[PDB]
Structures are given as structure tokens and as C-alpha cells.
Design a protein around this ligand. Structure first.
Ligand code: CLA
Ligand code: CLA
Ligand code: CLA
Ligand code: CLA
Ligand SMILES: CCCCCCCCCCCCCCCC(=O)OC[C@H](COP(=O)(O)OC[C@@H](O)CO)OC(=O)CCCCCCCCCCCCCCC
Ligand SMILES: CCCCCCCCCCCCCCCC(=O)OC[C@H](COP(=O)(O)OC[C@@H](O)CO)OC(=O)CCCCCCCCCCCCCCC
Ligand SMILES: CCCCCCCCCCCCO[C@@H]1O[C@H](CO)[C@@H](O[C@H]2O[C@H](CO)[C@@H](O)[C@H](O)[C@H]2O)[C@H](O)[C@H]1O
Ligand SMILES: CCCCCCCS[C@@H]1O[C@H](CO)[C@@H](O)[C@H](O)[C@H]1O
Lengths: 122, 56
């Protein structure tokens, strides 16, 4: 069943979030008397789009595709925090810690490089 | 000797050297085209085909 570091190292899989079977269409009960946490939140970006900036200011700018140039170094992972059950039965995730940012550089058509701090800090 | 404006007449009865002159001419023209296109790519701004197209 389970992969070791040696199985993963250099494959790209370390930058991927876990997936669930197509079979996983269930329901996870929330007991409002229980406290909860997210023990691991993982975010694997698959597309970065950048809003072009027109001279036009007439007509709205679109978000355009870009090419990632910093390789498989983009995901946020091992993030954790409290999952509060609120009085109206909504849940609120309050991020506490983890690998919660990655500098990322993507490149637009024509060469302009756009660095960003891809993040869910706080 | 030949006056300056007749120097290339040495090719009139030398088909191989005429071809060589022609080959040189074509090398020059094709190199002009390649160079011209590179200079245009170093200067062309592709970010506005509406108010800043190639012909502006
Ligand atoms: C397609 C262009 C071309 C070709 C294929 C030829 C080919 C020929 N020439 Mg002609 N010629 C040309 C253009 C050309 N010439 C030009 C523009 C001039 C005036 C400068 C001459 C003046 C000339 C003379 C006076 C003679 C020939 C002769 C000859 C023959 C022998 C080679 C030689 O001595 O060249 C001469 C060498 C050159 C002409 C060099 C050209 C000068 C350029 C501008 C320099 C290029 C350098 C660089 C790539 C660009 C710098 C540009 C700038 C930004 C600084 C041969 C049939 C000889 C001969 O056979 O006579 C019976 C001979 O005596 N040519
Ligand atoms: C395919 C076109 C073509 C070709 C292959 C020729 C070829 C020839 N010409 Mg003709 N000719 C042409 C078109 C052409 N000509 C045109 C358009 C005109 C009017 C401009 C002439 C007017 C003309 C005259 C009045 C004479 C010739 C002569 C000659 C012969 C000797 C050329 C020489 O040694 O110059 C040597 C040239 C130099 C050393 C320097 C010339 C520098 C020029 C003036 C400025 C620089 C030009 C620049 C490099 C080229 C870019 C060209 C491009 C923009 C077109 C040769 C058979 C001569 C002749 O019959 O000999 C018996 C002669 O007396 N030509
Ligand atoms: C089937 C026979 C055949 C073929 C295919 C050609 C084709 C050509 N000839 Mg002509 N020619 C022929 C028979 C032929 N010729 C015969 C029997 C004579 C009497 C000997 C001539 C006398 C003649 C003269 C005096 C001249 C030509 C030139 C040209 C060229 C002008 C276009 C050019 O340069 O474009 C640009 C070139 C390309 C886009 C490259 C094409 C790819 C090349 C041809 C592949 C090279 C490999 C090949 C094995 C080498 C020899 C090719 C040779 C058969 C042409 C072109 C390649 C002119 C030329 O050479 O100017 C440079 C020129 O001055 N020919
Ligand atoms: C249909 C297209 C075409 C034609 C017919 C020609 C024909 C000619 N070219 Mg080529 N050329 C072309 C396209 C063409 N060119 C292109 C697209 C380029 C890239 C820019 C060149 C680059 C080129 C170079 C670098 C050279 C030629 C030369 C020649 C001449 C070689 C035969 C000769 O001995 O003339 C004898 C010369 C003449 C008959 C006088 C031609 C006068 C021209 C038509 C007008 C020039 C006027 C003015 C004085 C220019 C001053 C320039 C100054 C401001 C810098 C001939 C007139 C060669 C040449 O001129 O050698 C002397 C030469 O060195 N050509
Ligand atoms: C892009 C690449 C560019 C590189 C090309 C650069 C090369 C260009 C060379 C051009 C120079 C040619 C000039 C040669 C000049 C030259 O040699 O003249 C004398 C020459 C006499 O020729 P002959 O047949 O007597 O032969 C003698 C030989 O020794 C000549 O090689 O006649 C011509 O050349 C005919 C046309 C020129 C007649 C022009 C006379 C001008 C009179 C003065 C005008 C100014 C005053 C006006 C006052 C209002
Ligand atoms: C080799 C050909 C070059 C011709 C270029 C002509 C362009 C002018 C346009 C057409 C008008 C022609 C009237 C000619 C009248 C005519 O019938 O001429 C024909 C004459 C040749 O005639 P012949 O063979 O009878 O020789 C007469 C000689 O013996 C002199 O008596 O051609 C020339 O003299 C060629 C040189 C003219 C050169 C003119 C000056 C070029 C200066 C270029 C400056 C360049 C600066 C470059 C900077 C980088
Ligand atoms: C075949 C052998 C010969 C090949 C060599 C010739 C190459 C010529 C290719 C031209 C295409 C590249 O053109 C070149 O692009 C870059 C990117 O926009 C421009 O670069 C400009 O913008 C960039 C991006 O903001 C700045 O970082 C840069 O300092 C500024 O100069 C150059 O000013 C331009 O001249
Ligand atoms: C013949 C090889 C020539 C070398 C080509 C340089 C790369 S291509 C070059 O790239 C720049 C940056 O992305 C662009 O801004 C420009 O539009 C484009 O022409």
C-alpha cells in the first residue's frame, strides 16, 4: 500500500495533494457538541491566471493564462487549525500554522514575469 | 584597367563565378530578412493590436 520517501523522491508526487476515490461521495457528521480541527489542509495549484492591465479602461481586463517557471514548488501543505462549529451550525476554519505560502513566479505571453506569494496565511 | 563602374563585368563569361556572385547576393538578401525580423522582434510591442498594431 504505502509510499516511502524513496518511492516519492524526485517524481513530482511530493508537490501533489492526496486524492480520494470516485467512490468517496459520503457525508461526515458534525456533532455540534464536539470540538474539531483540520489536521492537514493541502492546496495544489494547477493554474495561475493574471489579470492583464489594459490602456483601454474601456472594457474589462481578463485573467490570462501564464507559464509556471519555478517548477514543482507551488503547493501549500501540512496546514492545520481549529474547525469551529458556530451557533448557526456553520463551520469556521481558523488557520493556525503550516507550510502556508510559496513564492511562485509565472510568466505571461511575451516574457513579463509575475512573482507572487501564493498563500492562505491567517 | 577596368573603370570602377565595370568591375563586375569580369563575370560575363564565367558562369561558375556568376553563380557564386548570385549566391552571395542571395545570402546577403536572406541575411537582411533574418536581421530585419530580429530587429523588429526586439522592438515590437505585442500588447495592443487595437491601438498599437504593427503598422503604427
Ligand atoms: C552583392 C554584393 C557584391 C558581390 C557579390 C560582389 C562581387 C565581386 N566584386 Mg564587387 N562591389 C560591391 C558589391 C559586390 N561585389 C560593392 C557594394 C562595391 C563598392 C564598395 C564593390 C566594388 C568592387 C571592386 C572595386 C571590385 C569588386 C570585385 C568583385 C569580384 C571579387 C570580390 C571583390 O574584390 O570585392 C570587393 C570587396 C567589397 C566590395 C567589400 C564591400 C564593402 C561593404 C560595404 C563592406 C561590408 C562589411 C560589413 C558586412 C558591413 C559594414 C557596413 C557598415 C554598417 C559599416 C566579385 C565578382 C573586384 C573585381 O573582380 O574587379 C574586376 C574589384 O576590384 N567589387
Ligand atoms: C539585376 C539588376 C542589375 C544587375 C545584375 C546589373 C549588372 C551590371 N550593370 Mg546595370 N543597372 C541596373 C541593374 C543591374 N545592373 C539598374 C537598376 C541601373 C540604373 C540604376 C543600372 C545602370 C548601369 C549602368 C549605367 C552601368 C551598369 C553596368 C553593369 C555591369 C557592371 C556593374 C558594376 O561593376 O558596378 C560596380 C558598382 C560599384 C563598384 C558600386 C556601385 C555603388 C552604388 C551606386 C551605390 C550602392 C548600392 C547599394 C550597395 C546596393 C543596394 C541595391 C538595392 C537597393 C537595389 C553589370 C553587368 C555598367 C556597364 O554596363 O559595364 C559595361 C554600367 O556602366 N548598370
Ligand atoms: C534541374 C536543373 C536545375 C534546377 C533545379 C535549377 C535551379 C536553380 N537554378 Mg539553374 N541552371 C540549370 C539547371 C537548373 N537550375 C542548368 C542546366 C544551367 C546551365 C549550366 C543553369 C544555369 C543557372 C545559372 C547561371 C543560375 C542558375 C540559378 C538557379 C537557382 C535560382 C533560384 C535560387 O537561387 O533560389 C534560392 C535558393 C534556394 C532557396 C536553395 C535551393 C536548394 C538548393 C538548390 C539545394 C542545393 C543542393 C544541390 C545538390 C546543388 C546543386 C543545385 C543545382 C542543380 C541548381 C535555382 C536553384 C541561379 C542561382 O544559382 O543563383 C544563386 C543562377 O545564377 N542556374
Ligand atoms: C528585386 C529586388 C532586387 C534587385 C533587382 C537587386 C539588384 C541589385 N542588387 Mg540587391 N538587394 C535587395 C533586392 C534587390 N537587389 C534586397 C532586398 C537587399 C537587402 C537590403 C539587397 C542588398 C544588396 C547589397 C548589399 C548589394 C546589392 C547589389 C545589387 C546589384 C548587383 C549587380 C550590380 O553589379 O549592380 C551595379 C550597381 C548598380 C547598377 C546601381 C544600383 C543603384 C540602386 C538601384 C539604387 C541605389 C541608389 C542610391 C545611390 C543608394 C545610396 C545608398 C546610400 C543612401 C547608403 C543590383 C542592382 C550589390 C551592388 O549594388 O554592388 C555594387 C550590393 O552590394 N543588393
Ligand atoms: C550599402 C553599401 C554601400 C557601399 C557603396 C559605396 C560606393 C559608392 C561609390 C560612388 C562614387 C562614384 C563617383 C565616381 C566619380 C568618377 O570616377 O568620375 C570620373 C569617371 C571617369 O571615368 P573614365 O571612363 O574616364 O574611367 C577612368 C577610371 O579611372 C575610373 O575608374 O566617370 C564616371 O565615373 C561616370 C559618372 C560620374 C560622374 C560624376 C561627376 C560628378 C561631378 C561633381 C558633382 C558635385 C558638384 C555639384 C555642384 C552643384
Ligand atoms: C555601375 C552603375 C551605377 C549606376 C548608379 C546610377 C544611379 C542614378 C540614377 C539614374 C540616372 C543615370 C544617368 C547616367 C548617365 C549614363 O548614361 O551613364 C552611363 C555610364 C557608362 O557609360 P560609358 O560606358 O559610355 O562610360 C562613360 C565613361 O567613359 C565616362 O566618360 O555609366 C556610369 O557612368 C556609371 C556611374 C554613374 C555613377 C553615378 C553616381 C553614383 C553616386 C552614389 C553615391 C553613393 C553614396 C553611398 C553612401 C554609403
Ligand atoms: C540567430 C542568432 C542571433 C539571435 C540573437 C538576436 C536576438 C534578437 C531577438 C529579439 C527578441 C528579444 O527582444 C528583447 O526582448 C526583451 C523582453 O521584452 C526586451 O527586454 C526589455 O524588457 C524586459 C522585460 O521587462 C526587461 O527586463 C529588459 O531589461 C528590457 O530591455 C528587449 O529590449 C528586447 O530587445
Ligand atoms: C533565432 C533565435 C532568436 C532568439 C529568440 C528570443 C526569444 S523570443 C522573444 O522573447 C521575448 C521574451 O519572452 C519576447 O518579449 C519577444 O516578443 C520574443 O520575440
Amino acid at each position: 500500500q504505502t509510499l516511502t520517501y524513496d518511492d516519492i523522491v524526485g517524481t513530482g508526487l511530493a508537490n501533489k495533494c492526496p486524492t480520494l476515490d470516485d467512490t468517496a461521495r459520503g457525508a461526515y457528521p458534525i456533532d455540534s457538541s464536539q470540538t474539531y480541527r483540520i489536521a492537514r489542509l493541502c492546496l495544489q495549484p494547477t493554474t495561475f491566471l493574471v489579470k492583464e492591465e489594459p490602456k483601454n479602461k474601456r472594457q474589462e481586463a481578463e485573467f490570462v493564462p501564464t507559464k509556471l517557471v519555478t517548477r514543482e514548488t507551488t503547493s501549500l501543505d501540512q496546514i492545520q487549525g481549529e474547525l469551529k462549529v458556530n451557533s448557526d451550525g456553520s463551520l469556521t476554519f481558523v488557520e493556525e500554522d503550516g507550510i502556508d505560502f510559496q513564492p511562485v513566479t509565472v510568466q505571461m505571453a511575451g516574457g513579463e514575469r509575475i512573482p507572487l506569494l501564493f498563500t492562505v496565511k491567517n | 584597367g577596368l573603370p570602377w563602374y565595370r568591375v563586375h563585368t569580369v563575370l560575363i563569361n564565367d558562369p561558375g563565378r556568376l553563380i557564386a556572385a548570385h549566391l552571395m547576393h542571395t545570402a546577403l538578401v536572406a541575411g537582411w530578412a533574418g536581421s530585419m525580423a530580429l530587429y523588429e522582434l526586439a522592438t515590437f510591442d505585442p500588447s495592443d493590436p487595437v491601438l498599437n498594431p504593427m503598422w503604427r
